RNA sequence: AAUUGUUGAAAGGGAAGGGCAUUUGAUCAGACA
RNA sequence: AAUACUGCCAGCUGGGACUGAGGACUGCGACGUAAGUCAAGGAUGCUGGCAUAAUGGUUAUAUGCCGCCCGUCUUGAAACA
RNA sequence: CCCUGAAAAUGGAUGGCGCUCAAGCGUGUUACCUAUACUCUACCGUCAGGGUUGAUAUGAUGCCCUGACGAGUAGGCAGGCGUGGAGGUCAGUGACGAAGCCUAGACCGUAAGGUCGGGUCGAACGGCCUCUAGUGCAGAUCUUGGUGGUAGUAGCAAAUAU
RNA sequence: UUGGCGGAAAGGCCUUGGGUGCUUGCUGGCGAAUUGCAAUGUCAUUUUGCGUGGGGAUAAAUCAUUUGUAUACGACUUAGA
């Protein structure tokens, strides 16, 4: 439907975002996910910290290099959830994964692009209220992810340059909204009114 | 098995559509009324409906009339079975046993 | 010999076909196809062209016209199944169209008869097109699907 | 003007398959904006084309088309099964495909 | 010019090659049936090669017809060639592989003048 | 035929670590090289352009000799003689063009667009 | 024949080879009239 | 009174898919005042494209899914037989 | 239902990812996906039941109609394929090229196999009805011969020395 | 072309001024056929290659030799107009 779909990761439940992102991929849809550090996980922080440590202890005994690899960054945590839902050793699986990019914060290009949201993985719509959950950047930091402060710093700055963007924009739609008002009551206008516009 | 009470409508549409005759074995399609009279005219019964009448009413010659009919070969129910698992009794939410006049909806989908 | 030779040869006498039972009965048209309806040509040379429906020809085709002065389509044959009949409609009750048969379009540049026949039909049409505003422009636009158009949804 | 499309956009999903055996004789087509079975019974019978490019020119073009037809609906979400003059090449899984408007009935 | 025949349908055009003919040189492709007790092929496990069987048998009506529509007949000399004199829409003559250069020009020419088809007409031709 | 051979910087020239200095092979090849030079001298071939165009080695019949192994045993101790052939050739530039002409064949709908593209425009 | 050199073509992210299917490349029969 | 529900109609009717075996006639019927006609013991009519590597066969490669070494003895073998 | 009771050795398995008003547990209603099964059709074979010697063309173990059926080790039987030699025959093929060998070239058969093209080749050889056996190989730590990977590797260092 | 912003991967965003094309805002003149009743009917963007001429630029690494802060061999670290 669109060449690329930028997903604001914030507020989505990991495996559910991973699951729709996975299918989209395999159906030809390019996808980049942003703000992976504001991702959510059901269950409280401690459970998912433990869970991560369970994962953390598995490795090839005779050579901890060949064994499993434990990536700390919230994007890569997410990628792991996601690659688990793709036949990633097939060619078609590698095909589909190249159509995917995960990101902490919202870096260039995609910060000027509009990002969308996935209702069926939105935590605020999914989780029963009163349930406990986990933020991915908090989880990632407790297991050796370095860059939580640098990301929040760059994001706070980016949000500042964006609040201006919006502000200028809302100011201009006030003109357009005012323009369209005087054009209302005219002949074009009541005709379009008729045709549903 | 699943069985029940056939209605005239489903006996009619069974004989008409998938009704065949054992004639020197040779499972013969019923297609013409003269096929029947040749083999069942002995006992009355000289039309395809003369058959259905003998069947549905259980006449004096239901043995020879009913045996003249080859077993009916039905397909699987066209909308499915309705139950999740088949090999329980109808009463217990499966398909087998005597489901009485509910046999007609079953059979009509299998025809 | 190198090969023996068969005991039986199949006779080369060629049989004749059984007497088939297939009458060519006439083709009834879908109710949306009435003369003077605006079609959308879905495929072929003039694809996406909006065009006026005139006569149902004996070979099952449909007689259309641009009109040629509106959008460049001539009096032409078109297959009823490669067409969307719209709901918009001019009155064709002053168009000859009788002249036009299958043999008319035998293959056998443009015959002067056709160039004229085009003008006589067209003039009648235009005179009626002009009766509803913007219709003449519509008939010179091409139809295309825009983003979001859902054919199984759109009233035509 | 800018648009010219006379088809509905499509996507070649999978072959028809079980868990562990596919059937290359039936492709499964995802039609843009068709989301239920009832919506997709409109497209039954429409012709599909998978257009693709090639290096060897042929009949004076470097562009080739495999033609098919929607034949039946699939599942509950407006997926649709379709068959082609030659099965689609399984690399096409996730490629774009063109569902036309003919044989029309409007 | 062959007699009319129903669309020739072949049923399994892929050569039935012997199991493991692809594996050891010693094992020729010529079909051989597996007699082993565990052999996946004999047991018909899903994924392995298929085996000859009578279901594959060609339609009686079109069996032995090569493309054109003519059952082929091996021809060694004119008298052999002439046996197809009343049968040109049913049989094509194939010249035997050992017929000499000159002798094939006689058969070809006689075949031409009789309306009999020939399947390998460029053999030993003096081009 | 290079496994467990040593490494040398001299392989770098060729992207290689394992290279060697087989003097009896060299001395035999340049022997036959020399002969092909002469043969082209007498042919009148412009020696200034000669390049080695085909040079192949495969194996002459082996030569049995035997050595003596522990507990009273015998083992083959063979030679691996070779068959060498090479041909030099006067290098030469270009090749010119010239080929088919590509039979273009297009349906009636496919010549109409062509004719109209020129009827319409250039 | 195993096996080897050269030349040509092609594939190769912890073997190779096989089945059904199709794209692409190469190659070829027959049939039109 | 209506509606639902369940059942019936030898009531009407649209969209889609696969198939077209057979090769004179012969049968059982149907429509017709009639002559004739027919959807009644298996596809015909009309139009177009190419006449070619277009379709098809072979082959090599890629891709989806699938595929453990054969032989043997054995209750049981891919077996660390 | 959940928690405690609940301790093992390479890292690790509700099949995996992951899931928390579930993608968990109980239970109900629908729709949906797909077996070599089921229904209909085409073809192949097997078995069965019919019909047909009437000349003046070509199979009577034939030809025509019809129905049903088709898993298989050990094992039985059947009908076929291929080799060496023998009787008969085709007044068969051949130095204007027999036999053989090569060939991701063509065709026939379900298959054993059969046929052809080309290339190499150089003196013989085949079809059909019969007869006959020292008549078909992947195996037997099979027999004899030939050849690989190993591998330019182990190694070529005792006896003082050039 | 004026001024300004953007380093998270900025490599893009904003603003000034003239030049020029288009304008379906509205009203006109001309054209379209025969591509024959459909046959994607070809309008994307990848990399490379060959000559033409409008700017711009004129190295190094390796073998060999050598050091010994290094070394089984490669490799490492030095030196040499
Ligand atoms: Mg895919
Ligand atoms: Mg894609
Ligand atoms: Mg590992
Ligand atoms: Mg994974
Ligand atoms: Mg993919
Ligand atoms: Mg909620
Ligand atoms: Mg339903
Ligand atoms: Mg269904
Ligand atoms: Mg069911
Ligand atoms: Mg169940
Ligand atoms: Mg049914
Ligand atoms: Mg008739
Ligand atoms: Mg009608
Ligand atoms: Mg109607
Ligand atoms: Mg116009
Ligand atoms: Mg797939
Ligand atoms: Mg499926
Ligand atoms: Mg196909
Ligand atoms: Mg794929
Ligand atoms: Mg075959
Ligand atoms: Mg065997
Ligand atoms: Mg096995
Ligand atoms: Mg066993
Ligand atoms: Mg001769
Ligand atoms: Mg020859
Ligand atoms: Mg080696
Ligand atoms: Mg070494
Ligand atoms: Mg080594
Ligand atoms: Mg060593
Ligand atoms: Mg090397
Ligand atoms: Mg020794
Ligand atoms: Mg000794
Ligand atoms: Mg050796
Ligand atoms: Mg044009
Ligand atoms: Mg033009
Ligand atoms: Mg590896
Ligand atoms: Mg293949
Ligand atoms: Mg002809
Ligand atoms: Mg009701
Ligand atoms: Mg009814
Ligand atoms: Mg027919
Ligand atoms: Mg037929
Ligand atoms: Mg009457
Ligand atoms: Mg009729
Ligand atoms: Mg061709
Ligand atoms: Mg041509
Ligand atoms: Mg082809
Ligand atoms: Mg040809
Ligand atoms: Mg062509
Ligand atoms: Mg074609
Ligand atoms: Mg190749
Ligand atoms: Mg292959
Ligand atoms: Mg597998
Ligand atoms: Mg084996
Ligand atoms: Mg035991
Ligand atoms: Mg046993
Ligand atoms: Mg066991
Ligand atoms: Mg075994
Ligand atoms: Mg074991
Ligand atoms: Mg509970
Ligand atoms: Mg372990
Ligand atoms: Mg558990
Ligand atoms: Mg779950
Ligand atoms: Mg599960
Ligand atoms: Mg539940
Ligand atoms: Mg329902
Ligand atoms: Mg099954
Ligand atoms: Mg089956
Ligand atoms: Mg059946
Ligand atoms: Mg008999
Ligand atoms: Mg059996
Ligand atoms: Mg046999
Ligand atoms: Mg024999
Ligand atoms: Mg013999
Ligand atoms: Mg020989
Ligand atoms: Mg060769
Ligand atoms: Mg070959
Ligand atoms: Mg041939
Ligand atoms: Mg072959
Ligand atoms: Mg043949
Ligand atoms: Mg040959
Ligand atoms: Mg030859
Ligand atoms: Mg020879
Ligand atoms: Mg001699
Ligand atoms: Mg003989
Ligand atoms: Mg014998
Ligand atoms: Mg013996
Ligand atoms: Mg064997
Ligand atoms: Mg054998
Ligand atoms: Mg032998
Ligand atoms: Mg052997
Ligand atoms: Mg062996
Ligand atoms: Mg054996
Ligand atoms: Mg051996
Ligand atoms: Mg060796
Ligand atoms: Mg040496
Ligand atoms: Mg050594
Ligand atoms: Mg020693
Ligand atoms: Mg010494
Ligand atoms: Mg001394
Ligand atoms: Mg930066
Ligand atoms: Mg980026
Ligand atoms: Mg930058
Ligand atoms: Mg301007
Ligand atoms: Mg415009
Ligand atoms: Mg174009
Ligand atoms: Mg230059
Ligand atoms: Mg100097």
From Swiss-Prot, chain A:
GO terms for molecular function: mRNA binding; RNA binding; structural constituent of ribosome. Gene3D superfamilies: 1.20.5.4280, Ribosomal protein L13. InterPro entries: Ribosomal_uL13, Ribosomal_uL13_CS, Ribosomal_uL13_euk/arc, Ribosomal_uL13_sf. N-terminally acetylated by acetyltransferase NatA. Transmembrane segments: none annotated. PROSITE patterns: RIBOSOMAL_L13. Pfam families: Ribosomal_L13. It is found in: Cytoplasm. There is a cross-link at residue 175 (Glycyl lysine isopeptide (Lys-Gly) (interchain with G-Cter in ubiquitin)). One of its GO terms (biological process) is cytoplasmic translation. Keywords: Acetylation, Cytoplasm, Isopeptide bond, Ribonucleoprotein, Ribosomal protein, Ubl conjugation. GO terms for cellular component: cytosol; cytosolic large ribosomal subunit; nucleolus; ribosome. Component of the ribosome, a large ribonucleoprotein complex responsible for the synthesis of proteins in the cell. The small ribosomal subunit (SSU) binds messenger RNAs (mRNAs) and translates the encoded message by selecting cognate aminoacyl-transfer RNA (tRNA) molecules. The large subunit (LSU) contains the ribosomal catalytic site termed the peptidyl transferase center (PTC), which catalyzes the formation of peptide bonds, thereby polymerizing the amino acids delivered by tRNAs into a polypeptide chain. Present with 43300 molecules/cell in log phase SD medium. NCBIfam families: L13_A_E. Belongs to the universal ribosomal protein uL13 family. This is Large ribosomal subunit protein uL13A.
From Swiss-Prot, chain C:
Keywords: Acetylation, Cytoplasm, Isopeptide bond, Phosphoprotein, Ribonucleoprotein, Ribosomal protein, Ubl conjugation. It holds the Pfam family Ribosomal_L6e. The keyword Zinc does not apply. N-terminally acetylated by acetyltransferase NatA. Transmembrane segments: none annotated. The modification N-acetylserine is found at residue 1. InterPro entries: 60S_ribosomal_eL6, Rib_uL2_dom2, Ribosomal_eL6_CS, Ribosomal_eL6_KOW, Translation_prot_SH3-like_sf. GO terms for biological process: cytoplasmic translation; ribosomal large subunit assembly. It comes from the Eukaryota. The modification Phosphoserine is found at residue 11. GO terms for molecular function: RNA binding; structural constituent of ribosome. Signal peptide: none annotated. Its main location: cytoplasm. It is found in: Cytoplasm. One of its GO terms (cellular component) is cytosolic large ribosomal subunit. Gene3D superfamilies: 2.30.30.30. Belongs to the eukaryotic ribosomal protein eL6 family. Component of the large ribosomal subunit (LSU). Mature yeast ribosomes consist of a small (40S) and a large (60S) subunit. The 40S small subunit contains 1 molecule of ribosomal RNA (18S rRNA) and 33 different proteins (encoded by 57 genes). The large 60S subunit contains 3 rRNA molecules (25S, 5.8S and 5S rRNA) and 46 different proteins (encoded by 81 genes). Present with 37100 molecules/cell in log phase SD medium. This is Large ribosomal subunit protein eL6A. It comes from Saccharomyces cerevisiae (strain ATCC 204508 / S288c) (Baker's yeast). The gene is RPL6A.
Curated annotation (Swiss-Prot), chain D:
The keyword Glycoprotein does not apply. The keyword Ion transport does not apply. There is a cross-link at residue 46 (Glycyl lysine isopeptide (Lys-Gly) (interchain with G-Cter in ubiquitin)). GO terms for cellular component: cytosol; cytosolic large ribosomal subunit. N-terminally acetylated by acetyltransferase NatA. Keywords: Acetylation, Cytoplasm, Isopeptide bond, Ribonucleoprotein, Ribosomal protein, Ubl conjugation. Its main location: cytoplasm. HAMAP family: Ribosomal_eL33. Component of the large ribosomal subunit (LSU). Mature yeast ribosomes consist of a small (40S) and a large (60S) subunit. The 40S small subunit contains 1 molecule of ribosomal RNA (18S rRNA) and 33 different proteins (encoded by 57 genes). The large 60S subunit contains 3 rRNA molecules (25S, 5.8S and 5S rRNA) and 46 different proteins (encoded by 81 genes). Belongs to the eukaryotic ribosomal protein eL33 family. This is Large ribosomal subunit protein eL33A. The lineage of its organism: Eukaryota, Fungi, Dikarya, Ascomycota, Saccharomycotina.
Curated annotation (Swiss-Prot), chain E:
GO terms for molecular function: structural constituent of ribosome. It is found in: Cytoplasm. One of its GO terms (biological process) is cytoplasmic translation. The modification Phosphoserine is found at residue 39. One of its GO terms (cellular component) is cytosolic large ribosomal subunit. It holds the Pfam family Ribosomal_L32e. Keywords: Cytoplasm, Phosphoprotein, Ribonucleoprotein, Ribosomal protein. Its main location: cytoplasm. InterPro entries: Ribosomal_eL32, Ribosomal_eL32_CS, Ribosomal_eL32_sf. Component of the ribosome, a large ribonucleoprotein complex responsible for the synthesis of proteins in the cell. The small ribosomal subunit (SSU) binds messenger RNAs (mRNAs) and translates the encoded message by selecting cognate aminoacyl-transfer RNA (tRNA) molecules. The large subunit (LSU) contains the ribosomal catalytic site termed the peptidyl transferase center (PTC), which catalyzes the formation of peptide bonds, thereby polymerizing the amino acids delivered by tRNAs into a polypeptide chain. Component of the large ribosomal subunit (LSU). Mature yeast ribosomes consist of a small (40S) and a large (60S) subunit. The 40S small subunit contains 1 molecule of ribosomal RNA (18S rRNA) and 33 different proteins (encoded by 57 genes). The large 60S subunit contains 3 rRNA molecules (25S, 5.8S and 5S rRNA) and 46 different proteins (encoded by 81 genes). Belongs to the eukaryotic ribosomal protein eL32 family. This is Large ribosomal subunit protein eL32.
